[PDB]
Amino acid sequence: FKLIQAHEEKAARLSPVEEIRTVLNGSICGMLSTFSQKYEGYPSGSMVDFACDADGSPILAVSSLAVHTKDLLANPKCSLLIARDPEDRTGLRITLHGDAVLVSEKDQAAVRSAYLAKHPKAFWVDFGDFSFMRIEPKVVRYVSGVATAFLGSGEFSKEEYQAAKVDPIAQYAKPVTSHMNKDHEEDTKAIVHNITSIPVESALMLDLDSLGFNVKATLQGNTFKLRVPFPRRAQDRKDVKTLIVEMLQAAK
Amino acid sequence: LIQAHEEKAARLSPVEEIRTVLNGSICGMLSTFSQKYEGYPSGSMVDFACDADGSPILAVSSLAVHTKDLLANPKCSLLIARDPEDRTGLRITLHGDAVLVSEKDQAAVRSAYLAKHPKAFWVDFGDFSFMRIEPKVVRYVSGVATAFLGSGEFSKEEYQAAKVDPIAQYAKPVTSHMNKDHEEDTKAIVHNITSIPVESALMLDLDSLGFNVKATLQTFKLRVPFPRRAQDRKDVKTLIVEMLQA
């Protein structure tokens, strides 16, 4: 109740801009808002795949037959809504506002590879109906914990957002969280219990970065999220395993 | 072979399908004009509940960004994904005007909202108000990266006149009993009706004319129509057993 609030406020985590920079870079799909070309005066929403380029600018592969493509050609001002955990309503949600710009011929090759890195089977991007567009950010806004005590919000300029680096350990979140959630969830419960002093019934690893990881934990009927910081910054894929064993050894 | 079965299988009309799916949805993506960032649109996740006419009811906090957006410009849109993770699924965008609910309509609107969000106790707090998106146009797209790409739009009058299918409300219990315990029965029915030797058949939704399934042979969706319209919950069980016997 009060121990959770005191632990979360002190636990090491990425800075706000690095968290938003990292979550966006790891995201591959979101909700595009445009000005409706056909229904004048109304906005319009659609689902789009995307991939951030090296600067964090979303790359879209848009079909000339899509409604949202016609919207963007008539008015390039748009927004992109990202949900870290789409089903979690208390999760982090990011809105990137910017201007959709056709990618130049010089930039085609770098843009195409950045997009296929996130959508490896998207070989329609070479078809004539499809073009790459880049949403050049104007402002990046986020909200977190809507119906919770740890409600936070903020915004970043284009310059602040682009200067932040993507955390180099977050890319390993999927393999690490799988091996732990499938085979070694007892270890996660002990580590969380050792650090937070909460005897959690279950501890599910949500994400991962160089400073630690977050877990979905359950105690009685309440479900809540806990930050589990590493004793030091993780340096690589293997170092993440080393630190988990060290935190387990410090408990087990 | 799939295309010939899908084009002939009985299903709800387009406007009744969209009316039914929207009425069954309780969360979506709201697009607004950004009050703070002049010239830009904005997106947010919102809970909602359709009223009896199909108009989405929102319970908005005075502290939320999208509330300030809607108060500055009521013109908005609501994006609903029947199966949000299925990229070929049906997606509906309702465009309309967000209107404060009047004092006379508060009670009916509150009950419509709590029917879909029974634990939303905060709707009574002072920070919260009910808004209704009065529809201007309802647009849909389906099978966006498939051979069966379809689209269309409905006026406010066409959308409001359509009825919500009275059997779709039973989709969750029926699909649970079948997908967990009787997927062999579902596979037999699908193979019997479509003449497709399906390896697995996962029941997706339900209406009075049949149900849709996710099937795999050597992944695609198949419509499984009932031999006649189902009249109630028990009749759905009667018809499924009847189709299994065949």
Curated annotation (Swiss-Prot), chain B:
Keywords recorded for this protein, A-Z: Chloroplast, Heme, Iron, Metal-binding, Oxidoreductase, Plastid, Transit peptide
Keyword Oxidoreductase annotated: yes
Binding of heme b, residues: S61, V65, H66
Gene Ontology cellular component list: chloroplast
Site (Dimerization): E153
Subcellular location: Plastid, Chloroplast
Keyword Transmembrane helix: no
EC number(s) recorded for this UniProt protein: 1.14.-.-
GO annotation (BP), single: heme catabolic process
Principal place of residence: plastid
Region listing for Dimerization, in residue ranges: 27-47, 75-97, 136-139
GO MF, one example: metal ion binding
Purpose of the protein: Dimeric beta-barrel protein binding to heme and catalyzing its degradation to produce biliverdin. May function in the tetrapyrrole biosynthetic pathway.
Quaternary context: Homodimer. Binds to heme in the interdimer interface; the heme iron is coordinated by a fixed water molecule.
Protein's recorded name: Non-canonical heme oxygenase HOZ, chloroplastic
Species per Swiss-Prot/TrEMBL record: Arabidopsis thaliana
GN (gene name): HOZ
